Amino acid sequence: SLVKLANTCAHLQNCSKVRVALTSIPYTKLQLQFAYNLYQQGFLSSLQKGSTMGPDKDFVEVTPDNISTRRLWVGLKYRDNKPVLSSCKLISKPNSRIHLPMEDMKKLCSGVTIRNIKPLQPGELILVRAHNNIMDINEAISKKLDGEVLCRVK
Template identity: 45%
Template sequence: MGIAAINNACAHLQNASRARLGLTSLPNTKYNLHLMLALHRAGFLSSVTRGGPHPPEDLSAPPVPITQANVATRRLWVGLKYWNNEPVLKRAQAISRPSRLVTAGLDDLNKIARGFPAGAAEQVS
């Protein structure tokens, strides 16, 4: 379920940025949360907020606590960034698939983070 969820999140972010949406939502899962927080720290997203089925009124408001009664309705609300009327995150594509898992060691991750090709992740640019 994890790799499929990441692929779905990447496709959703790409479609939302092509549609020029300012705010979009994803299911509140562990994989989606960690991916969105990593993209936010890297500067691709303007905000990441937990909320309900409707957009939060104020992004700085404290989130509603997750309980057994409302866990299925929780969403991650993600603010997309644009620069000169172009999306900052134009293309989001996972390189792993359920049929082909791509892993990388610390040395390869260091190269990828600097923009160099490394191992099976040479497509990343």
């Protein structure tokens, strides 16, 4: 869900503000994907499944017995007295969800304000959902996927 995603973004921002190292997130598929995307772009130092109490050392299979207590632990990242993941504003908010075609995404990438989105920035990452798979907006353009403009990290 999108509300959840917004909440996790807010939590990430809060954690960046006070400089915590290792932070929990809810264990869902969309959320996991988002976390993986951040990790690959280079905003998170670590990403690992775990309990509500902490990250897991060994593998523990997730079932109806565990699922309520399961959690996604995430390492934050800092360099020269400045946090890497400064912001996590989402674009498609729950009330005004926005879905762009490939042309619109291209325009956004090339410095054009679209549907009241400030076009994407030098060291920024706009994530895009396309058939229940979160991608970079550039990646989506390359693959040519009309998708929901999810969120924005800087």
